[PDB]
Amino acid sequence: FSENGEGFNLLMLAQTPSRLKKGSMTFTDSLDSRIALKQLLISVTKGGTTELFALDVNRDQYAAYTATREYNFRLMQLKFHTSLGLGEESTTVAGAESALLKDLFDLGYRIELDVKVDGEMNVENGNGDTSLRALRLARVFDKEGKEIALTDSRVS
Amino acid sequence: GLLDYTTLETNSTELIPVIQSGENDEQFIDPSVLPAQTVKQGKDTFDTNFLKFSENGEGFNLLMLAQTPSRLKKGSMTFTDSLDSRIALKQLLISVTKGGTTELFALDVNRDQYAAYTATREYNFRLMQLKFHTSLGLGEESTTVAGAESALLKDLFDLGYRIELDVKVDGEMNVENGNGDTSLRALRLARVFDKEGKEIALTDSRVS
Amino acid sequence: HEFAELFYRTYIVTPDQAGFQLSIRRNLVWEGWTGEGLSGEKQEISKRNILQGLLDYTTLETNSTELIPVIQSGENDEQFIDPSVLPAQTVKQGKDTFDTNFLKFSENGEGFNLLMLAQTPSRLKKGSMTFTDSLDSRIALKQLLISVTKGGTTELFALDVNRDQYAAYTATREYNFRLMQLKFHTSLGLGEESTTVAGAESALLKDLFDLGYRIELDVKVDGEMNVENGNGDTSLRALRLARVFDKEGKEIALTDSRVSAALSGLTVTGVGYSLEARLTNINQLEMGLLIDSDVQKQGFMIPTLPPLVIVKPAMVEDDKTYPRLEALTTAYRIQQMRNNAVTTLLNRADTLKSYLGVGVPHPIESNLGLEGVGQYYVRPYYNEATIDVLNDLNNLTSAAKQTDIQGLIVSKINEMVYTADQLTGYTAALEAAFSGRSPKPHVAIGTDMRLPQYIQINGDDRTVGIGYDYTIARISDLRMKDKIVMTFILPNESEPHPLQHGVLGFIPEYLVDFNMIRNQRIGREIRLTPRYRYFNFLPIMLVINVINLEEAIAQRTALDVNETQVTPAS
Amino acid sequence: KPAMVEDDKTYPRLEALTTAYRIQQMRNNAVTTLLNRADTLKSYLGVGVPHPIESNLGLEGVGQYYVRPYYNEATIDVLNDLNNLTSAAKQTDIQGLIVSKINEMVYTADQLTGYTAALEAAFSGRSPKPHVAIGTDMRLPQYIQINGDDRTVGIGYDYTIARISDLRMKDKIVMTFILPNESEPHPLQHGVLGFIPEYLVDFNMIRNQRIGREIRLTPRYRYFNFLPIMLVINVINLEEAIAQRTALDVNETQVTPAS
């Protein structure tokens, strides 16, 4: 996430060695209208232990870039503003089960976080940026689908 | 009212933030940074101040903030009150700081490129959307608020130079129930301009 | 009313629309693709508007077909002169950087093949040079290089001889018959201020240069060039000192004492040269200039406004306490069209003053913080001038003071409008947008009830400057009290257009009349809910503040005659 | 243009190419050449000092066979060279100030170069009065309008005022001798434009293994100079003279003690 505010040029990072042999040019190309994030890598850390969750975000419809022609005739907008849940069967990238959330998962609770990510992309130029805006623990569910407050002693 | 402009000009259907101490005071920047400003709508006398940015926390509610004693006496807030189609950012307040001295300037972002909520729905059919992304700069004579000219820019100003700022502001509003928030995404110094309108390097001795 | 009408043309909108969209076409030009910078770079290349190119000259023009010699280290060094005499020079053509030196004069050996000699790095990727390309219909020398040696010190002079009378290649009929010919027997001069390549006067000729003398060298250069396969060779035929010119242009004898002293032991030799030849291909391997287009579109929303409420008991209608509906209508019309209009005008003026500085024209698409679509047609400009009538005026005698003040104010308005036209490039945009007609700018004048009696001229021909049309506005709001606003508008059309100062977004609202119940009371209420919003398009405005008028008229005016410093003090 | 569709926005029609051609050829190159002409004459000859006829054989142009070479420049300080009676008469007096200087320079150039003799010689049976051309920006040319003085560029003279938008000639007047009756290349007009039209072509280029259609327009022309004469006038601080009071700069010329 580029919180320094300086963007990236996507047509650079993705030039393959075949294209290098093919030549060196990325400026007559055009990106398709379809842009969406594959995965959000969120780090669950507590006391120095880090777990990585490879979450497939492509299957939430708010992760799809939408065209808002308000600056130029080729910019499109990204607004993924929802909650993702980490269930008991959530698996790490290496394939192991959760460890920091193991205490709640063995108690059958479900943890979901509100994700507020914003970005922009231009097809013609390749200019674009996407920066994290707001992420936080949100609420806790039980088996019966009854909300459990964050301030409850069993989960606080 | 044909000569003076105040006899006919009155507003009584405007939402304005209102302050009352220690009971709703977490949507307002602490008064130790800026004293409260007195504004009068209708016959009610009350104080207002800029709503604060919130990044990782809960947003604000405009309806609960904009409830004036005239509306108290008429009855408690109901659910049929509706927000208008046009909502805009009036003032964006920044502080230029160098050496411990704080100078605040009120940018009149009202009437800027995209300082007005545009109809952009992705979740609800009511969610109003704002994307205020533009280069907003300070001129070579732009006087600070509360009188006089700024001192921290005295050297650049006396040389005839101009500075520019990039502003990235995002915010969402729901005209159905009064829930929404605003966040600051990026706001930094970007470029410096000469009196002849030609960009010079940021590595120049005077500019640095 | 007239006043808000001049600065904002009314635009009616259907009630259902909640906002109207303004999409404009803009034509773009930029040089090449960005291509590789690391393996490429994010395209920071300035796509600059073509109308900007109407004003400055660096937007256009490129040299992309010149057959500039290019050195390859260790391959063709022997055609170029020895780099000991002169280090490599770098010139830019498009996106390439490479080193160039003047060619060596062929004496007896094989000549040079220019086409294979002119491989820029781009052309190498472009594919190996094959002979289906043909040279320029005319070729010539760019610069001629000689070395003035006196005692051992060498000085270089880059004699720019291009566009000489006798430096253009010509056709001939011998040997081959695609052959071009270069006969160059001409007198070259070395000016009394002429500077070397490094940018300094000739030390060996400083003494000669002091007495106001010029050196003329007769030069003889010949060579051949073929336009079929680029073969060509040239040789130094004859070059020597010939004669001397003076400041007043009469030949000075070579045996004269001054000349003989100045020309002791001076030897002049030729070293190098260059050719102005361009590959006039039939399909072109060059991108020349690229033309692109973007679309920019702005949003505009029309709010709701506080309602205007009537009260009247409803079994009988009154005409004495509440008149016909005209009262509500006129109250709404004044409240809309005057108070809000003046407020938005002054707010616009102060916003421009804050953002844009004073008297400085900013380039297109650079420092915008305002509204419009005119910024893509004209450079922004804002300026203000204060008039101290008491201290600035010219009057020999009384019974002419009115003419005096009107002359000063008319001169000031002329200067403002003229400088605005000259700097903004507004009239060029007006000409470009409208084809088949060339309208002159129309200037609007808004002010209080004072100045109209002085801006209407009684006794002089000029009023706003002949060649300009005007419309005077009179208004009684105290915010305009002793103030003048100025701008450019177009009164011949009634549609949203980029060159109009402003448009009044106006949605008609129909009067509603139905019984309403306040605190369980019954009466007929006539409710008017207005909606509108004053918009702006053009970011150009001129404002003049005139003060001390009363004092100037009532108090003794006095010729501020310039006592000018002829009695020793300066 | 990508060669699988056609447009009107991303495809600017032939009109856009025509406009680009018009700009590049008609204005910018001509102005560059004129300023280069001025600079090279300045360097070769110097200010105010002519040269004998047929004293140059390698100087650009051919019309050195008829008129002595001459180049000169001058400046006007409107701030200090302005006497005013009434602020309702100031503008006319400024215009007269500029016009008189124009006239005097024209007369001086004519007298030194002997232009009238050349015009009478090269044309048999005609005695045409010289024609002066006015190249200037778009701020001045409203300041050559007065009837305050009968002389506009001087009696016995016809003139034409030309505008231009380019900023490089800010408040600069360029003057020369032309001839409006001619339409052929002759050594008495300032110069001719060798112009030959060309037509555009559109065809599929496959370069570096890419697909696209390109439209090419080949302009071919050249600017040439004949007359080695030109006069340049500069106007400085025109705005200040209007801006502040400029009353009688009355020189109090010392019938007083100590002088």
DSSP line for C309-371: E--B-SSS--SSSS--THHHHHHHHHIIIIIIHHHHHHHHHHHHHHHH-SS--PPTTTS--S-
Other beta carbons within 10 Å of B86: 18
Give the type of residue at B134.
Answer: T
Residues of B with CB under 8 A from a CB of A: 55-57, 114, 118, 120, 122-123, 131, 133, 166, 168, 170, 172, 183, 185-186, 188
Among candidates C248, C418, C560 on the partner chain, residue whose Cβ is nearest the Cβ of D49: C248
Other beta carbons within 10 Å of D241: 21
Chain A hits for B188, Cβ within 8 Å: 5
Judge whether D167 and D27 are in contact, CB under 8 Å.
Answer: no
Best A60, A116, A120 residue to mutate vs chain B (most B CBs within 10 Å): A116
Q: Distance from B20 to chain C by nearest Cα, in Å?
A: 26
Judge whether A97 and A91 are in contact, CB under 8 Å.
Answer: yes
* Beta-carbon pairs below 8 A across chains B and C: 91
Chain B hits for C306, Cβ within 8 Å: 10-14
Judge whether B109 and B89 are in contact, CB under 8 Å.
Answer: yes
Residues of A with CB under 8 A from a CB of B: 5, 62, 66, 68, 70-71, 77, 79, 81, 118, 131, 133-136
Rounded CA-CA distance B159/B196 in Å is: 12
Residues in Cβ contact with C506 at an 8 Å cutoff, skipping those fewer than 6 apart? C10, C11, C12, C13, C532
For C245, how many CA atoms within 13 A lie in the half-sphere containing its CB?
A: 20
In the block, residue with structure tokens 């005007």: C470
Among candidates A72, A126, A127 on the partner chain, residue whose Cβ is nearest the Cβ of C296: A72
Specify the DSSP class assigned to residue C387. E
Chain D hits for A72, Cβ within 8 Å: none
Other beta carbons within 10 Å of C153: 11
Q: Distance from D67 to chain C by nearest Cα, in Å?
A: 15
Identify the three-state secondary structure at position D204.
Answer: strand
Q: Which residues is C528 bridged to in the sheet?
A: C308
Strand extents, DSSP E, C13-101? 22-30, 48-49, 89-93, 96-100
Q: What residue of B is the nearest CA neighbor of C306?
A: B13
Other beta carbons within 10 Å of B149: 11
Rounded CA-CA distance C87/C71 in Å is: 12
Rounded CA-CA distance B2/C476 in Å is: 8
Q: What residue of B is the nearest CA neighbor of A131?
A: B185
Q: Distance from D140 to chain C by nearest Cα, in Å?
A: 9
Helix (H) / strand (E) containing D45: helix D30-45
In the block, residue with structure tokens 């009350």: B46
Query: Which of A118, A129, A132 lies closest to A10 in space, CA to CA?
Result: A129
In the block, residue with structure tokens 């910078």: C37
Query: Which of C542, C538, C543 lies closest to C420 in space, CA to CA?
Result: C542
Task: Give the CA dihedral C265, C266, C267, C269, nearest 10 degrees.
Answer: 160
Give the type of residue at A68.
Answer: T
Rounded CA-CA distance C342/C3 in Å is: 9
Rounded CA-CA distance C50/C377 in Å is: 10
Query: Which of C181, C154, C157 lies closest to C168 in space, CA to CA?
Result: C181
Rounded CA-CA distance A44/A98 in Å is: 10
Judge whether D87 and C552 are in contact, CB under 8 Å.
Answer: no
Q: What residue of C is the nearest CA neighbor of A71?
A: C296
Contact across the interface for A5 and B56, Cβ inside 8 Å: no
Q: Which residues is B107 bridged to in the sheet?
A: B92
C-beta pairs of A57-60 under 8 Å, 24+ apart in sequence: A57/A84, A60/A84
Among candidates A15, A27, A74 on the partner chain, residue whose Cβ is nearest the Cβ of C34: A27
Rounded CA-CA distance C433/D35 in Å is: 30
* Beta-carbon pairs below 8 A across chains C and D: 163
Q: Distance from A136 to chain B by nearest Cα, in Å?
A: 7
Rounded CA-CA distance C164/C546 in Å is: 59
Q: Distance from C29 to chain A by nearest Cα, in Å?
A: 15
Q: Which two tokens stand for residue C103?
A: 């060619």
In angstroms, what CA-CA distances link B4 with B39, C340, C406, C474, C480? 20, 12, 29, 16, 11
How far out from the chain centre does Cα C324 lie?
58
Task: Give the experimental resolution in Å.
Answer: 4.1
Identify the three-state secondary structure at position C235.
Answer: strand
Q: Is C428 exposed, middle or buried (0-12, 13-18, 19+ CB in 10 A)?
A: middle
- Reported residue count of chain B is 208
Rounded CA-CA distance D115/D132 in Å is: 12
Question: β-strand C442-447 against C469-474: which pairing, if any?
Answer: parallel
Q: Distance from B56 to chain A by nearest Cα, in Å?
A: 5
Contact across the interface for A25 and D212, Cβ inside 8 Å: no
Q: Is B196 exposed, middle or buried (0-12, 13-18, 19+ CB in 10 A)?
A: exposed
Among candidates D51, D91, D251 on the partner chain, residue whose Cβ is nearest the Cβ of C564: D251
Residues in Cβ contact with B49 at an 8 Å cutoff, skipping those fewer than 6 apart? B17, B19, B28, B29, B31, B34, B36, B37
Q: Which two tokens stand for residue C336?
A: 């809309």
Q: Quickly list DSSP for C272-293.
A: EEEEE-BB--SS-S----EEEE
Best C355, C479, C536, C541 residue to mutate vs chain B (most B CBs within 10 Å): C355
Give the type of residue at C123.
Answer: R
Judge whether C429 and C51 are in contact, CB under 8 Å.
Answer: yes
Chain A hits for B112, Cβ within 8 Å: none
- In chain B, which residues are followed by a C-to-N distance beyond 2.5 Å, i.e. a gap? none
Other beta carbons within 10 Å of C218: 15
Q: Which two tokens stand for residue C265?
A: 């032991």
Give the type of residue at B65.
Answer: L
φ, ψ (nearest 5 deg) of residue C328: -60, -45
Residues in Cβ contact with C214 at an 8 Å cutoff, skipping those fewer than 6 apart? C189, C190, C191, C192, C244, C245, C246
Judge whether A97 and A86 are in contact, CB under 8 Å.
Answer: no
Q: What residue of B is the nearest CA neighbor of A113?
A: B56
Specify the DSSP class assigned to residue D23. I
Chain C hits for A24, Cβ within 8 Å: 35-36, 39-40
Q: Which two tokens stand for residue C335?
A: 């409240």
Judge whether B133 and B114 are in contact, CB under 8 Å.
Answer: yes
Rounded CA-CA distance C69/C274 in Å is: 8
Q: Which residues is C542 bridged to in the sheet?
A: C383, C486
Helices (H), C373-532: 401-424, 426-433, 452-455
Rounded CA-CA distance B116/B112 in Å is: 8
Identify the three-state secondary structure at position C101.
Answer: coil
Q: Which residues is C310 bridged to in the sheet?
A: none
Judge whether C301 and B110 are in contact, CB under 8 Å.
Answer: no
Q: Quickly list DSSP for D61-114.
A: SSTTTTS--EEEEEEEETTTS---S-TTSHHHHHHHHHHHHHHHHHHHHHHHHT
Rounded CA-CA distance C363/C366 in Å is: 6
Q: Distance from C93 to chain A by nearest Cα, in Å?
A: 19
C-beta pairs of B56-60 under 8 Å, 24+ apart in sequence: B56/A134, B56/A135, B56/A136, B57/A136, B58/B181, B59/B179, B59/B180, B59/B181, B59/B182, B60/B27, B60/B180, B60/B181, B60/B182
Residues of D with CB under 8 A from a CB of A: 9, 208-210, 212
φ, ψ (nearest 5 deg) of residue D81: -90, 65
Give the type of residue at C183.
Answer: K
Rounded CA-CA distance C274/B76 in Å is: 90
Specify the DSSP class assigned to residue C430. H
Q: Which two tokens stand for residue C326?
A: 């005209």
In the block, residue with structure tokens 């650009």: D60
The three-state DSSP-derived secondary structure of chain B is CCCCCCCCCCCCCCCCCCCCCCCCCCCECCCCCCCCEEEEECCEEEEECCECCCCCCCCEEHHHHCCCHHHHHHCCCCCCCCCCCCCECCCEEEEEEECCEEEEEEECCCCCCCCECEECCCCCCCEEEEEEEEECCECCCCCCCCCCCCCCCHHHHHCCCEEEEEEEEEEEEECCCCEEEEEEEEEEEEEEECCCCCECCCCCCCCC
Query: Which of B129, D248, B182, B139 lies closest to C396 in space, CA to CA?
Result: D248
Identify the three-state secondary structure at position D178.
Answer: strand
φ, ψ (nearest 5 deg) of residue C339: -65, -50
Chain A hits for B55, Cβ within 8 Å: 133-134
CA-derived radius of gyration, chain B = 20
CA angle C198, C204, C207 (to 5 degrees): 120
In the block, residue with structure tokens 């007198």: C187
Rounded CA-CA distance C233/C112 in Å is: 6
Q: Which two tokens stand for residue C288?
A: 């020349």
φ, ψ (nearest 5 deg) of residue D67: -130, 140
Residues in Cβ contact with C509 at an 8 Å cutoff, skipping those fewer than 6 apart? C15, C528, C529, C530, C531
In angstroms, what CA-CA distances link C173 with C176, C179, C228, C445, D217? 7, 8, 15, 73, 33
In angstroms, what CA-CA distances link D160 with D105, D136, D152? 17, 11, 11
For C14, how many CA atoms within 13 A lie in the half-sphere containing its CB?
A: 3
Q: Which residues is C427 bridged to in the sheet?
A: none
Q: Distance from B186 to chain A by nearest Cα, in Å?
A: 6
Best D4, D7, D210, D213 residue to mutate vs chain A (most A CBs within 10 Å): D210
Question: β-strand C231-246 against C213-226: which pairing, if any?
Answer: antiparallel
Other beta carbons within 10 Å of C8: 25
* Beta-carbon pairs below 8 A across chains A and B: 35
> Please, which chains are in contact with A (at least 3 CB pairs closer than 8 A)?
B, C, D
How far out from the chain centre does Cα A63 lie?
8
Judge whether C162 and C273 are in contact, CB under 8 Å.
Answer: no
Q: Is B21 exposed, middle or buried (0-12, 13-18, 19+ CB in 10 A)?
A: exposed
Q: Distance from C142 to chain D by nearest Cα, in Å?
A: 14
In angstroms, what CA-CA distances link D113 with C247, D50, D107? 18, 8, 10
Chain C hits for D242, Cβ within 8 Å: 411-412, 415
Rounded CA-CA distance C90/A14 in Å is: 34
